[PDB]
């Protein structure tokens, strides 16, 4: 098993740098004493992989060394341990070159490159040879699948399908990694609904890719027909291209993307079309959710996939162990099924049958055997309280003071692909930089969101790589959207913005209508300048600076403090005067404010806000927000 020791050595070939800045440390442990690993730390494949990849407190370092102080199918646990520990440690301890690459990133990329190089060998002049394969897996019609929902259970499906979808993608990648004798490090990273992998450029890998593509096409045709159709596109790559030599790394990314698009253009093969147009029986009964008749339908007018999706919806928040096994609730490729169960159920599934995969959700522990950590933001305020868990979003609508409405948010990053392709300059562009950026984005959207929304009445419908769906209390939705904007701004250190749409609806308003209206709101918010928030009416679109400070802090707060003789009737009279929007109406507003017994400072502030044109709509929005918040 030379490949296993090679993987261990490549991952741990820089373990000595930690103790040096705090091989022999590896020799301290008998399981890690194996010849291949220690040889790599201090073979030639590890050196060539490190060359390909390359092209703060001492007490805390000692504490990390103390914390740190090899069988098959155990590499995943060590990889999780490396990801959990070496994230903050830079790969280059001290160099004039910027330390963008972290220790974990360098170790993972080196291990992937070493595995690919060893697979190539099994089958400077070495760099020029086409030795790698950049492959991309992209599922099609994802949001169409997510939003095709039967009303009576739509919310459940809305939470589950996306989760199901993401888990499905993970399984696919793992199966490919299972058919290539590779580890989880060999995948570069997985965006929302899109995965990117680095593979050896051998005949075995190409044949495996072709077989995987065909079998996944067959499975998606069988199960979801044309609703979901993953496409896999690979391009041959040389060592110099991976090292950004000759400036072709971005060229490789772009050519893989356009090859994937071309493959998407010609999707189905000839016999697949023939089988599509060969339905013997039409079928009378149809499902509520997917509106499909060919699959057998229960008495409740729900498809089998739909029923499993609803089951996984009620299960997902309760437990934290996704088991891919022959036993489960929802389908997964290669005749598998996805279930969500506790640790006892997880270990039962492990012991009963082999080849059962386990994914622990947001669990940083690595001592558990045969678990791969999946990141997912499932923050639900209703789940925190059992009665609210029973009630649902109607609990969010429940509110002592404030208009009982429900707010929906559909945030999305702006020009992310431009940042990935064009944002990173030519000099610094490397696959380690791209991997670090993608991992940071996934960690922010899937893990940091639960921290940001903590203490708020918001339920995360989905928190994919770019898109974000939230639904909860309207005031809480708006406040947490502003907090999310500022947190994202300080996390990205600028250079990244997201546009958002916040819509307010009644409790019993249909979920599909809410989603469509908030989607069109955020579509107007994107506009052309980007970095905008569309609040309430689609006519009004504001900026984050305006909404956080000009609308709420500058105008709404003084009005709240003054209102707390003054009553809601005065606010409604002022609203009528402002919304009339005529010069004589500003004169009448001046009269009313003169005889309103209001403070002269605030009176002049309101008059000045009414004089302007943008401040007019800002003051209108501020008073509307105050009226909404002050309802009984």
């Amino acid at each position: 098993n030379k490949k296993l020791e090679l993987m261990y050595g490549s991952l741990l070939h820089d373990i000595g740098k930690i103790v040096y800045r705090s091989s022999q440390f590896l020799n301290k442990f008998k399981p890690f004493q194996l010849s291949g690993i220690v040889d790599s730390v201090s073979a030639y494949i590890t050196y060539i992989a490190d060359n390909i990849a390359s092209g703060y407190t001492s007490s805390q370092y000692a504490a990390l060394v103390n914390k740190m102080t090899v069988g098959p199918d155990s590499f995943s646990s060590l990889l999780q341990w490396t990801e959990s520990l070496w994230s903050y440690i830079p790969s280059s301890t001290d160099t004039n070159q910027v330390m963008d690459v972290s220790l974990y990133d360098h170790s993972k990329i080196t291990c992937a490159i070493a595995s690919c190089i060893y697979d190539y060998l099994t089958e400077k002049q070495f760099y020029q040879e086409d030795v790698f394969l950049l492959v991309s897996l992209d599922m099609s019609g994802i949001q169409d699948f997510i939003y095709n929902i039967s009303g009576s259970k739509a919310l459940k499906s809305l939470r589950s399908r996306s989760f199901y979808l993401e888990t499905m993608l993970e399984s696919l990648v793992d199966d490919l990694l299972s058919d290539l004798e590779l580890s989880r490090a060999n995948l570069l990273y997985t965006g929302g609904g899109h995965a990117y992998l680095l593979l050896p450029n051998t005949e075995r890998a190409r044949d495996v890719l072709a077989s995987f593509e065909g079998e996944m096409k067959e499975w998606f045709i069988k199960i979801f027909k044309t609703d979901l159709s993953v496409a896999i596109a690979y391009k041959a790559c040389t060592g110099e291209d991976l090292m950004n030599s000759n400036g072709t790394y971005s060229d490789l990314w772009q050519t893989v993307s356009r090859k994937l698009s071309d493959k998407k253009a010609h999707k189905y093969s000839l016999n697949e079309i023939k089988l599509f147009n060969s339905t013997i029986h039409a079928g009378t009964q149809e499902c509520k959710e997917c509106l499909r008749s060919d699959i057998d339908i229960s008495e409740d007018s729900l498809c089998k996939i739909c029923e499993g999706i609803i089951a996984i919806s009620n299960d997902l928040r309760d437990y934290s162990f996704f088991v891919v096994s022959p036993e489960g609730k929802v389908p997964l490729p290669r005749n598998r099924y996805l279930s969500v169960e506790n640790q006892d159920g997880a270990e039962r599934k492990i012991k009963m049958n082999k080849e059962t995969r386990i994914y622990s959700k947001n669990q940083p522990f690595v001592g558990k055997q045969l678990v791969t950590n999946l990141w997912m933001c499932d923050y639900d305020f209703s789940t925190l309280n059992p009665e609210t868990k029973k009630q649902g979003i109607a609990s969010y609508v429940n509110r002592e003071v404030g208009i009982p409405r429900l707010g929906v948010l559909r945030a999305d990053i702006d020009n992310l692909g431009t940042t990935f392709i064009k944002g990173i300059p030519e000099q610094y562009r490397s696959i380690s930089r791209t991997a670090t950026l993608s991992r940071q984005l996934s960690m922010f959207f899937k893990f940091e969101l639960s921290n940001i929304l903590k203490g708020a009445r918001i339920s995360v419908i989905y928190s994919g790589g770019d898109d974000l769906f939230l639904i909860g209390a309207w005031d809480d939705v708006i406040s947490k959207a502003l907090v999310l904007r500022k947190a994202f701004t300080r996390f990205s250190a600028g250079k990244l913005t997201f546009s958002a749409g916040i819509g307010m609806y009644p409790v019993k308003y249909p979920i599909s209508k809410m989603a469509s209206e908030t989607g069109v709101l955020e579509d107007l918010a994107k506009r052309g300048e980007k970095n905008q928030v569309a609040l309430w009416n689609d006519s009004k679109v504001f900026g984050w600076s305006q909404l956080e400070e000009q609308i709420l802090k500058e105008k709404m707060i003084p009005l709240q403090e003054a209102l707390t003789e003054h009553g809601k009737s005065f606010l409604y009279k002022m609203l009528e005067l402002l919304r009339n929007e005529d010069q004589i109406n500003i004169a009448r507003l001046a009269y009313l404010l003169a005889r309103s017994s209001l403070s002269e400072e605030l009176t002049q502030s309101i008059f000045a806000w009414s004089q302007n044109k943008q401040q007019k709509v800002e003051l209108i929005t501020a008073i509307e927000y105050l009226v909404y918040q002050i309802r009984e």
Binding site: N148, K225, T226, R258, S261, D262, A265, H266, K267, Y268, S269, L270, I273, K274, F276, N277, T279, I280, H281, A282, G283, T284, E286, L291, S293, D294, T418, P510, S512, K513
Partner: protein, 296 residues
Amino acid sequence: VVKLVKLTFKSPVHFGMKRLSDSNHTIAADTLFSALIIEALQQQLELSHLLNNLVITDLFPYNKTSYFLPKPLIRIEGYKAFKKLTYIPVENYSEYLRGEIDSLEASKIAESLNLGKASLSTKVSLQAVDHNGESEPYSVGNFTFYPESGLYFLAKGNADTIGQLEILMHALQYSGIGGKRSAGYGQFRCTIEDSGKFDSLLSQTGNIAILLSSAMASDEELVDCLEDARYLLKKRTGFVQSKTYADQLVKKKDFYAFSAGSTFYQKFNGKIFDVSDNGRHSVYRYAKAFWLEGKI
């Protein structure tokens, strides 16, 4: 003889695709052909010409400025604007085929098209109210066209077929088209006219072929047409609309056809696929192909 037909929609139209809530601004040629068959059977007309020699296209937008055509699916060498782009004016079609259109120009073309405004009408059913029940709300998607805009299509056939189609369109003006008819939707006025520009554009000899309708070929033509061709499958399905098929309303067999605008290097013909599932009569579905030559 190719004959332009323009429809001006006095009332909003449903033109649903998968649900009642959604509204499409256009419909495939299969829906139009089914409506023509229904109208001909209502008028006791002969179906020999419609089934044999009548090659129609999808419904395409037309504005006050210029007519529109589906965007051909060819490689583009940002791309999000191109993917969002759906319809190309007739004068810019050749430029797009050569690729002279850029991302900014593609976005400006997308903004240039002004068909109308889509919206949602919330209606109810009160039939259960008197029977100790409650009203049931539902939604209908309606796309109200701009006063200048409308929906045109091209129909090629013999003179007898052209006359029969003229009669059928004269009847359809009041029978309505699309979905949710008899509830205030689908009323339109027809205008059948000869178009020199479309005659010139269709009469070309290009290296590729672009589909102007939802079409599907037989087994052999499908065998010799899919080679290095970019397309997009549309799931044509739904229920059967007739009073002489079954005692209840049942769905027809699911069908799949290439979208209009798909580029096929080899030109394949189409047939009127039968989607009847053991019924009194044969529920037809239009899948003939209307081809436009193009240069890339």
